[PDB]
Amino acid sequence: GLFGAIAGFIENGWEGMIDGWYGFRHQNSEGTGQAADLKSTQAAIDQINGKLNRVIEKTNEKFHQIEKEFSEVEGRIQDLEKYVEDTKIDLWSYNAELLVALENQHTIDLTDSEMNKLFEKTRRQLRENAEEMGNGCFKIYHKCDNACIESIRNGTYDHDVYRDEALNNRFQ
Amino acid sequence: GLFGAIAGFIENGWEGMIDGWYGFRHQNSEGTGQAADLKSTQAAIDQINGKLNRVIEKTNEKFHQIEKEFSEVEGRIQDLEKYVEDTKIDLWSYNAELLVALENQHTIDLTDSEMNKLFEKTRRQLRENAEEMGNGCFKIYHKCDNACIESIRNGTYDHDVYRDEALNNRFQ
Amino acid sequence: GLFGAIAGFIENGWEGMIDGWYGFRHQNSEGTGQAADLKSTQAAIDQINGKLNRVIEKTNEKFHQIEKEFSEVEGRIQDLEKYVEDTKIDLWSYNAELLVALENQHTIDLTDSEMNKLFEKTRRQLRENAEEMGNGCFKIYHKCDNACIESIRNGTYDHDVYRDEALNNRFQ
Amino acid sequence: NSTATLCLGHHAVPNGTLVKTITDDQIEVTNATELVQSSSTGKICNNPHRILDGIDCTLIDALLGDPHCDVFQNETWDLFVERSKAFSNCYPYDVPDYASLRSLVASSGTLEFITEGFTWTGVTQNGGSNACKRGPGSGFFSRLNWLTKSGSTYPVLNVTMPNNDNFDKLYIWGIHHPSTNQEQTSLYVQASGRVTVSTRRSQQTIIPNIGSRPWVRGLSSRISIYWTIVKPGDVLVINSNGNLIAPRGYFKMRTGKSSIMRSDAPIDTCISECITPNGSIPNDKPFQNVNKITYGACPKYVKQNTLKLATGMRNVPE
Amino acid sequence: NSTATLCLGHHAVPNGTLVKTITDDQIEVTNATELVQSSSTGKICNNPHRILDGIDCTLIDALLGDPHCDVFQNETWDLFVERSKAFSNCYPYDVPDYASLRSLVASSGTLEFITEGFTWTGVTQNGGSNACKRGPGSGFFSRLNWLTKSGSTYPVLNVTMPNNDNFDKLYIWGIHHPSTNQEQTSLYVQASGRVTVSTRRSQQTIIPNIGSRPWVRGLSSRISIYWTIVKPGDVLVINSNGNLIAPRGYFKMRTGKSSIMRSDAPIDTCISECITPNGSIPNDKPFQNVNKITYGACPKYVKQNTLKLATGMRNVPE
Amino acid sequence: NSTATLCLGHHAVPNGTLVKTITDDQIEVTNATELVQSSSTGKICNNPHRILDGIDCTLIDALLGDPHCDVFQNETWDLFVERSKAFSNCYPYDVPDYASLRSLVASSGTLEFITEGFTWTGVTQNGGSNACKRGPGSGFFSRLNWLTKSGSTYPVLNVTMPNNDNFDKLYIWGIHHPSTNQEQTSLYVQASGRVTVSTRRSQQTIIPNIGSRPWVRGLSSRISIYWTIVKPGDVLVINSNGNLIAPRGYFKMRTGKSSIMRSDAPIDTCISECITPNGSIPNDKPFQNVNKITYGACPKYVKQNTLKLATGMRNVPE
Ligand SMILES: *[C@@H]1O[C@H](CO)[C@@H](O[C@@H]2O[C@H](CO)[C@@H](O[C@@H]3O[C@H](CO)[C@@H](O)[C@H](O)[C@@H]3O)[C@H](O)[C@H]2NC(C)=O)[C@H](O)[C@H]1NC(C)=O
Ligand SMILES: *[C@@H]1O[C@H](CO)[C@@H](O[C@@H]2O[C@H](CO)[C@@H](O[C@@H]3O[C@H](CO)[C@@H](O)[C@H](O)[C@@H]3O)[C@H](O)[C@H]2NC(C)=O)[C@H](O)[C@H]1NC(C)=O
Ligand SMILES: *[C@@H]1O[C@H](CO)[C@@H](O[C@@H]2O[C@H](CO)[C@@H](O[C@@H]3O[C@H](CO)[C@@H](O)[C@H](O)[C@@H]3O)[C@H](O)[C@H]2NC(C)=O)[C@H](O)[C@H]1NC(C)=O
Ligand SMILES: *[C@@H]1O[C@H](CO)[C@@H](O[C@@H]2O[C@H](CO)[C@@H](O)[C@H](O)[C@H]2NC(C)=O)[C@H](O)[C@H]1NC(C)=O
Numbered sequence A, B, C: 001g002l003f004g005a006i007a008g009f010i011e012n013g014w015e016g017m018i019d020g021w022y023g024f025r026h027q028n029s030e031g032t033g034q035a036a037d038l039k040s041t042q043a044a045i046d047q048i049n050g051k052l053n054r055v056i057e058k059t060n061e062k063f064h065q066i067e068k069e070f071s072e073v074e075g076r077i078q079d080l081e082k083y084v085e086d087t088k089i090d091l092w093s094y095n096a097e098l099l100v101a102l103e104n105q106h107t108i109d110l111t112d113s114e115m116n117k118l119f120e121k122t123r124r125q126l127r128e129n130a131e132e133m134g135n136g137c138f139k140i141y142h143k144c145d146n147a148c149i150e151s152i153r154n155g156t157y158d159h160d161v162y163r164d165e166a167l168n169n170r171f172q
Numbered sequence D, E, F: 001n002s003t004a005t006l007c008l009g010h011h012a013v014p015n016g017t018l019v020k021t022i023t024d025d026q027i028e029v030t031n032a033t034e035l036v037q038s039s040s041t042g043k044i045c046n047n048p049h050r051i052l053d054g055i056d057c058t059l060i061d062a063l064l065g066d067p068h069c070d071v072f073q074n075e076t077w078d079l080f081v082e083r084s085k086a087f088s089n090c091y092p093y094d095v096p097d098y099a100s101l102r103s104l105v106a107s108s109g110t111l112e113f114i115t116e117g118f119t120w121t122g123v124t125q126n127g128g129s130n131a132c133k134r135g136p137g138s139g140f141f142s143r144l145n146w147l148t149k150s151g152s153t154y155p156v157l158n159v160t161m162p163n164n165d166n167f168d169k170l171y172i173w174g175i176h177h178p179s180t181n182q183e184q185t186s187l188y189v190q191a192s193g194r195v196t197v198s199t200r201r202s203q204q205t206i207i208p209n210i211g212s213r214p215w216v217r218g219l220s221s222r223i224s225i226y227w228t229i230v231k232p233g234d235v236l237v238i239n240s241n242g243n244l245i246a247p248r249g250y251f252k253m254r255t256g257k258s259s260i261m262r263s264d265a266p267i268d269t270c271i272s273e274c275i276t277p278n279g280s281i282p283n284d285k286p287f288q289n290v291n292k293i294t295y296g297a298c299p300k301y302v303k304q305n306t307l308k309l310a311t312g313m314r315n316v317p318e
């Protein structure tokens, strides 16, 4: 939520998206369509999996310890044992809480950053043939086919072929 | 300080601002003015209050404990008690330090991010009728009234009405 | 890696750069060149040094403690001492790990943010005489000398002198 | 003019506050709040806790029945306050494992004493001393019974007491260490004493140690104090042939929230939920730097007098 | 139309999950996982650990050789399970520092007993009791030797035993506390007993305490149990003149991974690496909220079972 | 050409360094620094600390006055170094609570001994032994006094000693455990001994245990060592009727920074502020992986020998 992409200038999500996490949706002169982008989804999935499998691997193995349940009242030694146990439990619960609280924030912020990165890349591709309409979509001022949007999707859009037509369409 | 908005491309603050945390200041053809924006200020205040009231709620309640001040020198039990107390104090002071050190950084970065979000929204509103002058202000290339700036402030600016005039003013 | 500048839209690094951490490299009408920018490098170095010298200053000084190595088997007191020592060691190793894990991420993200800040400043300087080519370079649509690039480097570029020539060059 | 301008910015304050961050050690923000609380009022409020002021008596002397602590019979406390001006004015005594008994009785919260009818046949009861005057004549502790020989003999005592109730019983007894070998045989005809107190699962046997001690209030003899706990369904047996300070009954043992605290602060009629040996402190802040000994819902003791948390943006003045 | 459009967006789910963050306390994401495991199966799997079921016997009674624990001779365990229905049916005894011996034998993992040839000349061996019937006649513990007077005298017993092996030896002995002063002199002609057991670096001397005790299974006498550890190159010397419960050999002492656990859960033939007093629990999660007593590769015990970690983006539905 | 170009970028290095992050476990940066330190020089520098080399003597033998530790009289140390080649060559002795006395004297930092004039009337002073030769004749410890009977009697000793100074006094005394019942009555005419040492707030009474022990340097008797602390305004009283190893004075007790360390490393004339049992280690790094026993301003002991913090950007080579 630091970049303002998810829950920011993109109003809602797409519940019909089942291929990946991030994707496109175009409205053309031949109809409508929809697709996904594998790279951003893969980056997010790899980062989240790395984090998850980072935290959950084990570190402790204890065999013999002290007594923690007593049937009598004795004195100093029992008091010290109970104090030690209470201190250990209270000091580990705080770590358990803080780790989750920090990692959830970092996960949310990185999954928000990936969307902004994809948006900025798509903006940088359409050099001066498109205008940002403010709600997550680009208005492309020249006429594409279903093969023009796919060149924008797999990163080989050639902007200089449609430059003169777009400039005469948008500025006059 | 990660986005470069506060203490970045905005030189200084406005000490005459007493309504909110973030606001506007326009220079028009009828004079000057000033106002505030409630939404960004509210988001920042809610986040900071949530964090604050998150950390300060209590968790401990201790009634009987061990002895921590002695009048004699005895031996093993007293040494173990003093060691336990020293370890507990040293382990809690580190947490006290690290929590504050992390949360101050996060607070500063989020209060810096809100400004960049407001700036980017205002830039996205003025589609092609404005140019960014590099120091936090926009030069609007058509002529507004005191009612044109307020349409930009409450999020209902219609860019297509002044498009032809602005394009002829800025590009020729 | 949150801003997408380093290892993002900048493909690789410059191994011939030995003056600073961030710098420029221009291709002109009189040849090529290279230089550095002191301010971003200085900000990054100061932040990283502050962090480093923040963590490594000492806090502990212990003179008398408990026994931690025994030659016999005795009973309750020895068990409690071994438990205390094991708990202390296990609780300090976790802090040692988490501090480094958090600070490395913050260092990487801040050294990535400085590059994006420099890029955005350079973009804001060339108001409408340049276009971003998408791979980290700007195409400047008027003709500069070796003294025009240096005005862009020390922050005194005057955009309005070359405005008409650049606008006629890029848009027609 | 045929153009306009629209500038954006944030607020600043003339004096801000310095805080520490992950990168910087002193960065100036518009506002900050304190985490520690390092002050006290100086008095101990008596609400909503039940405070008992042990003016000139300790807990053990109020337990045994010192003649100048007879106002503390069946005192029910929520927090016992022990003063430093306390002293003892009865038979000089001694407690092995004093801290254990003090913490056992402090956390129980009651001095309720149920008297029981023991049958000691062959001995003389209600022994007195000139170091423990209760009124104008000689006296002793009010919860203990000093038995001596009856005429010319001292038979072997052998009493029993069953526990048919549904709570635990605390018995306090003692043993008398004489000064010479002549006063031993003039009070207990046997040349050596022994006291055995046994339940179905434990036993304690003590033997007196004849010798001389420093003079305390005019005496060189001593008394050692021991205690026993009888659980429901158990039984108590006392066997002896001299040097026995018998009990008169039992204290009722409870479990709850109660403790003890050494402090020389007066008591007022305010309201506070936290109590430190310096007085009552408010508990609106999560941390405190007054005392590490606390009772109630108290903040945690830290070593800093300053830890500031930022609640605003950075401060960049004109 | 001579234009086009290209919109970007992300996915959402109808029901998401609420997680906690640094700023918010309840924020809705598309997916979350739990890290705490708070269920148990109810049974204790006997693989790949070696579990021993102490049905009606404790560890100390199986060590001494109680007649109803004779199936536990040379039992090798990896985890001893102690039931609550356990009882003793032999001579009433007592162990000073019971927990120390219980933890010393529990962590050793063996009851392997090597018998040794001691020479007790002048006394009668293999004493018996009617409270410890092994079969139809009187009996005693199978690892101890009750020596009494031989005809009319009881000489001063003084035995040696050297340790020439390369491991430690554990010797278990005891002392007999009689009931009256008549049965003392009818079993050991001396009016007072004493037992000394010494190595080259330590020594233990015990003296019997004549007195009466509560009746347990028809007896008011007692036995106190002590132990000695002989290291390689050392020597053991036993000196006595009455009230000696001699040993018959030594237990072999090992070091490894072994422990003991009180639990009333049955045992099945599943496979699990973690064992709690409630049964076996899986160990796929890092945390657990079942029991704080654990054996094996077990997750850590936390107080909170609501710990949700987000593994997806934020959930913004239509 | 009528245009130009201006590219931006960052630097890279050919070999970078792998570090761990929140997301990745191995990410390559341009530079990194180590947190741990795990090498030692091998020698113990004697500056600016004051190191004392206990070549063939322990602390307790240098306290009592062993004849081969007479060079350690009034040694003032800042850190005592104990070697493993140490041995004892005097009367065989024994200390109950040895670690307590060792840690009490180690942290005091002085062996300053003030001799006092005690008056023992009716006994013979300056007892000797053939196991503690000081020169060509028999001897004993230099800080203790072995009293035996004077001709045909051994009266009841009863000495006093007041403390009028403004510091604490440490008294070291002992008791003699004989070997047979014939050598007891030939040194102290009484058939049983007893030693009482008392202050105004404490008391210690010990009784000798006659018996045989393993032969150590030609003797089967023993000595047990006890100590007493007298605070300003207090008083010390010693009562006895046999088996007393009297003191000759008191040690002065201080408080400061001092300790003890077992190590077999030589001592050189370098300068270092940290000392480990392996030798001196520098303290430029915050962490160390050499030893968990440390003296001075030492880094903390961690388990990881490798722990790298990034001080540069990411490394993306050509
Ligand atoms: C063995 O030595 C001790 C130590 O002096 C002797 O004990 C002392 O006995 C006398 C008897 O009068 C005590 O005197 C009392 O002193 C107090 C304090 O001034 C005074 O108020 C009394 O009126 C009386 O004079 C003396 O206090 C006591 N020693 C101490 C230090 O208390 C003991 O008598 C000697 N052995 C014997 C029995 O000869
Ligand atoms: C009770 O039994 C013990 C164990 O045997 C006896 O202790 C033993 O005492 C003899 C004394 O002659 C020791 O022999 C001596 O050994 C040393 C060392 O080699 C040697 O220098 C002497 O000349 C002598 O030969 C023997 O080692 C010792 N055994 C041990 C290890 O304790 C004890 O004496 C017996 N008590 C009696 C006499 O009732
Ligand atoms: C001194 O007091 C003690 C404790 O009361 C007396 O011990 C008691 O001795 C009798 C002897 O018969 C024990 O009686 C036994 O009770 C059991 C339980 O019902 C019963 O099964 C036996 O057949 C027998 O009747 C009695 O248990 C025992 N006290 C306790 C509480 O166990 C002792 O006798 C008294 N002094 C003397 C020696 O007279
Ligand atoms: C990227 O997408 C474009 C979509 O336009 C692919 O290109 C077309 O490729 C087919 C196959 O030969 C041709 O018939 C069309 O004429 C192409 N159209 C255009 C506009 O180029 C292209 O192959 C894709 N490249 C990769 C690497 O996936």
Ligand SMILES: *[C@@H]1O[C@H](CO)[C@@H](O[C@@H]2O[C@H](CO)[C@@H](O)[C@H](O)[C@H]2NC(C)=O)[C@H](O)[C@H]1NC(C)=O
Binding pocket: B147, B148, B150, B151, B154, B156
């Ligand atoms: C947002 O601000 C604009 C400022 O222009 C408000 O609009 C004007 O509304 C008044 C009231 O009827 C009219 O007389 C003006 O002609 C309007 N001017 C323009 C340029 O539209 C508008 O009402 C505000 N809307 C909200 C929801 O606050």
Ligand SMILES: *[C@@H]1O[C@H](CO)[C@@H](O[C@@H]2O[C@H](CO)[C@@H](O)[C@H](O)[C@H]2NC(C)=O)[C@H](O)[C@H]1NC(C)=O
Binding pocket: C147, C148, C150, C151, C154, C156
């Ligand atoms: C910033 O860089 C510019 C580079 O152009 C410097 O300017 C030139 O200064 C020299 C020295 O007098 C003149 O001869 C040139 O005509 C200038 N060229 C231009 C394009 O201005 C300038 O001095 C530098 N300023 C600072 C503060 O470093």
Ligand SMILES: *[C@@H]1O[C@H](CO)[C@@H](O[C@@H]2O[C@H](CO)[C@@H](O)[C@H](O)[C@H]2NC(C)=O)[C@H](O)[C@H]1NC(C)=O
Binding pocket: D038, D039, D040, D277, D278, D289, D290, D291
């Ligand atoms: C609360 O009371 C304690 C104990 O009386 C005070 O602690 C002492 O403070 C003085 C002066 O700084 C020191 O000389 C003592 O050594 C302290 N005693 C300790 C630490 O046990 C404490 O200062 C009081 N706090 C307030 C806020 O009044």
Ligand SMILES: *[C@@H]1O[C@H](CO)[C@@H](O[C@@H]2O[C@H](CO)[C@@H](O)[C@H](O)[C@H]2NC(C)=O)[C@H](O)[C@H]1NC(C)=O
Binding pocket: E038, E039, E040, E277, E278, E289, E290, E291
């Ligand atoms: C595992 O077993 C323990 C012990 O039997 C259970 O703990 C007890 O739970 C009951 C019911 O909540 C409480 O009344 C007791 O006080 C608990 N005893 C303790 C804490 O020592 C525990 O609930 C069991 N857990 C599961 C998952 O079955």
Ligand SMILES: *[C@@H]1O[C@H](CO)[C@@H](O[C@@H]2O[C@H](CO)[C@@H](O)[C@H](O)[C@H]2NC(C)=O)[C@H](O)[C@H]1NC(C)=O
Binding pocket: F038, F039, F040, F277, F278, F289, F290, F291
């Ligand atoms: C410092 O000295 C200690 C103790 O001599 C060394 O620790 C031992 O290391 C050996 C070899 O790894 C192990 O076999 C021992 O079990 C260790 N003893 C312990 C841990 O108590 C340690 O390696 C030395 N360190 C350096 C850097 O020389």
Ligand SMILES: *[C@@H]1O[C@H](CO)[C@@H](O)[C@H](O)[C@H]1NC(C)=O
Binding pocket: D031, D032, D033, D311
């Ligand atoms: C600073 O914050 C506190 C509460 O956190 C508030 O009471 C105070 O008014 C704030 N300061 C200013 C100048 O508003």
Ligand SMILES: *[C@@H]1O[C@H](CO)[C@@H](O)[C@H](O)[C@H]1NC(C)=O
Binding pocket: D073, D074, D112, D113, D114, D115
């Ligand atoms: C204390 O309480 C008990 C039980 O209520 C009562 O028997 C006893 O008399 C009370 N003590 C006094 C001083 O009356």
Ligand SMILES: *[C@@H]1O[C@H](CO)[C@@H](O)[C@H](O)[C@H]1NC(C)=O
Binding pocket: E031, E032, E033, E311
């Ligand atoms: C949520 O994540 C878990 C694993 O973390 C996965 O098994 C599950 O399928 C995910 N939920 C959805 C709806 O994909």
Ligand SMILES: *[C@@H]1O[C@H](CO)[C@@H](O)[C@H](O)[C@H]1NC(C)=O
Binding pocket: E073, E074, E112, E113, E114, E115
């Ligand atoms: C237990 O093991 C030892 C050594 O193997 C053996 O001597 C002894 O006979 C075994 N016990 C039984 C019950 O046979």
Ligand SMILES: *[C@@H]1O[C@H](CO)[C@@H](O)[C@H](O)[C@H]1NC(C)=O
Binding pocket: F031, F032, F033, F311
């Ligand atoms: C890496 O950093 C260290 C100090 O942190 C510095 O001494 C070293 O020169 C740096 N490496 C390079 C290649 O500059």
Ligand SMILES: *[C@@H]1O[C@H](CO)[C@@H](O)[C@H](O)[C@H]1NC(C)=O
Binding pocket: F073, F074, F112, F113, F114, F115
């Ligand atoms: C040790 O110091 C004390 C006090 O200065 C002194 O009386 C004594 O003689 C010194 N010891 C030696 C060996 O002289």
